[PDB]
Structure formats: C-alpha cells, structure tokens
C-alpha cells in the first residue's frame, strides 16, 4: 500500500517475491538437536546437506 511503499523507499529494502515459511522452534520448548532427516522426492536434486 502507499505508506508501505513509502516505507520501502525510505529504508531502501527490496521487497522479495518470496515469503518465509521456515520451520521454527515452538514458543517455550527448548532442547538439543540430536538428529536430522531429509526425505526427498525421486528426481529432485539433493541439496548440499542432504
């Protein structure tokens, strides 16, 4: 909207075409990461970590 558009103009941030869906720790539960698994569809390239 206009005032948001002014906001980006003043603080000069390029508003991305992508939205943040990242999985984040629920509020208040806190622990140590003991494992990670990556399941991938057959045919998509496994990323570095995977």
């Amino acid at each position: 909207t206009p005032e948001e558009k002014l906001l980006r103009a003043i603080f000069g941030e390029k508003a991305s075409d992508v939205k943040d869906s990242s999985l984040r720790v629920p509020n208040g539960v806190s622990g140590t990461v003991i494992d990670v698994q990556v399941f991938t569809r057959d045919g998509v390239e496994k990323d570095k970590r995977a």
């Binding site: 206009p2 002014l6 906001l7 603080f11 941030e13 045919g43």
Partner: protein, 468 residues
Amino acid sequence: TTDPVRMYMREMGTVELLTREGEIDIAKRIEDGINQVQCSVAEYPEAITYLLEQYDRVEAEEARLSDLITGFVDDPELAREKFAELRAQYVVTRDTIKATAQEEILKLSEVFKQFRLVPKQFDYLVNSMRVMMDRVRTQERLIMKLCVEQCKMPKKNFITLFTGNETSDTWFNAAIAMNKPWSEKLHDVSEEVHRALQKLQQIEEETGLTIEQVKDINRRMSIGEAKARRAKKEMVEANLRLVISIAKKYTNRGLQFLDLIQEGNIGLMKAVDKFEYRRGYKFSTYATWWIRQAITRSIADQARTIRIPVHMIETINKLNRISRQMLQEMGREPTPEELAERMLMPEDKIRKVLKIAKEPISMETPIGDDEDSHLGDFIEDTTLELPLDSATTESLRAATHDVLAGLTAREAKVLRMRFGIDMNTDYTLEEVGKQFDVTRERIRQIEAKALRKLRHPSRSEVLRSFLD
C-alpha cells in the same frame, strides 16, 4: 411407496413391448406424419420466397453454405445450379393464377421437397407460419367479438355468408340490410372492425393467399406434427427397458441410477429422431449406441464437483488399467515414473493429472473422537487479517502522516504524490512536475533529499520499528 425408482419401474411396466412387425407400424406412421408437414411446408409461398431471399444472402457472402442446407435429395457448384431450378419452377407457377394454376403449383412443391434444410431455418419457417397465423387469428377474433359480443349478433348467421370470404364487405355492410333483429345493430362498430381488416387482407398480399387457404395449411401441418410426436412418443415408451438395461452398467461411476437412465432416456429420444427403418437395422441394436453415447457424455460432463474436460477422463482411465497388470507383475505396484513410460504423453504430467483427478473430501467428514468434531471445523481462515496487524495499519498512517507534516508543505505534497498516500493511485514523476509548473529533474531531486531527511534518526527512530 415413495422411492422414485419404484414408481418409475411401475409406471413404465405398463407399456407393453413391441412385436418385430409392430416396430415398423409406428415407424411407418412417423414417415407419414413428417411427410405431411413437409408437404404442408412446401405449399407456403412465403416459405419459398424466403428461401430465395436467404440464398441471395448466401451468394452475397452474407451467410455460409452450412447455415441454410444440410444437402438435398440428390458442392458449391451443385448448390448454385439446384437453387436456379427452384427459382425457375417458381416463376412459371407464379403468374398462372388466372384456377388452371393448380397444375403448376403442384410442381413448385416437388422441387422444394428435395431440400433438407438446416433445422434452425426450418423451425423459423414453422415459427413464421404460426406467427403469421397468430397474426390472422388476432384479426379473426377482433371482427367476431366486436360483432357478436358487442353489437349483439348471433354466430349462427354470422358464419353463413362468411365461409369462402372473411375479407370482402359481403359480410360487413351487406348483411346489415337483411333487416334481421341483429342486422341494423352492426353499424355502430363499423369504424373499428373494417380498419383492422387492413392487416387481415394484407396477409393475403404478403403470403399471397386468401384467409381461406391460410387456415388449412398449417392446420394440416399441425396434424402431421402432432402425428409425428404421437408415433415418436409411442416408440420411446416401448424402449425404456433398453435404457435401463444399458444404464445398469454405469451405476457407481458417480451418478445416480435415475440420473443415468434419464440422460440415457434422452439418448433413446435422439435415436428415434434419426432412425430409418429402411436401412434394415433392428431398432434395438441401433439405439444402444445413442443411449450409451448419452450416458457417458453426461457422466463425463456433470458427475464431478470440479468439471474436467473429456480427454482428461480418458487419460485417467488408461492409468488405472496399466497399474493393474503392473500391480502384481511388479509385485508391489509401479513407481510414479513407471506408468509414465507406459503412457504416450510427457509422463511428468502424470503428477499434474493425478492432482486434479482427486474428488474433494466432504468438509463434514467426521474426524477423530466422533465428537461432531468435523474436518471443516479445523479449516482456518487465511484471508483474515489478525488484529495485531490491522492495529499496526491504523498506526502506520498516524506514523507516516506525522512525519509528513514535519517536512515542508511541498515535500509532503511531493511524497504523498509519488506514492498513493491518502490519494487514489500514484503519479509518475513527470505528472508531478507539471502540476508544480517547475518540472522534471528538479522534482526528482527534492524527493531524494526528502527520503534522506527521514533516513537519519530523530525522524528515523519511529518508522524503523515497522521492519522485522
């Protein structure tokens, strides 16, 4: 007993099955019925002249060869020369009414009966006749009610010198001198009846037929038309059992039984219209294709909550089949790319096709605990706006409006201008330059310094908290 399946099975069970000969009985009647109306249609002069007026529009590139004829009884060339024959037979028959005409008016019909017209055009003729005949009846009822009901004259003597005329004045002004009790009463309405006769006798000019002939033709036509439907209806009733036997195949495909047999019944209706017993095809084995055509064409079309094109369905069906041999053959079941090779197409479309193919799940599907907790109760609104945002929106105006009164009256005007702030749309910087009479680069410069003026803090400390 309710359950419309039962009251149908029993309403049709009354109609008795046709004998192998009996099928032909009704069918002969059909031909007879239609041929009567065809002959009844051939006898209309305006019906001829209209086709003439229509073909001159075809040769004038005002229509296409497909929008008038479907071909006759016996090509652009062939079409051109056949119409000339019609035009030829018309102009002889036309001038001979000096009685003896009868012999030639019979021939004008013959050429006209070879033409099988596109159904739409045919209907307009039929429409035009009855519309023209309503036009006659309108005038017929006016002259009677203004005489019989208003001026109090009996219909017994009103029809005596009528038969044969109902146009000229023998009945209107010459029946008033018979000195009957109802005779002298006819003078009062004269102005109103005789002026409306214009359209009545004009019909005999347009149609070129006296009000005498005008009734007979489309009356016989009505009889034939009526006759046709009678026979056709009769035929359909005999074959309902067939539709049921065919529709019993398609039950759970996702449409109701009675949904099926009704769509199938229509298929049976189509079959009667196009059937010819002269081809020696048993009517039983001929309609099956039409009924079956109707069932599937409907099931494909309307049986889904998300309607999908036909080829998509057929695409889908092949896939189930393939999974079958390969199901036990591969011992578990084929991989998402296995049937892909089996199928012609790009094979990654399997995934795309597989998505739209799923049927939506009932939002009332009871989930866990059975506690009337239902799936739909768990579907959150994503189009809503949480108040913690809407609150910051009401605030962001107050933020930006304040910082804009902290600037020069022109910087606020210029910045509210470059953006949509409290104004419909925003303005290209060229438009803004013209508004100020001081234009172009000048304005572009001021904007820069403005953003620069709110970048450093004192100003900057309040608006920064908006970013995350």
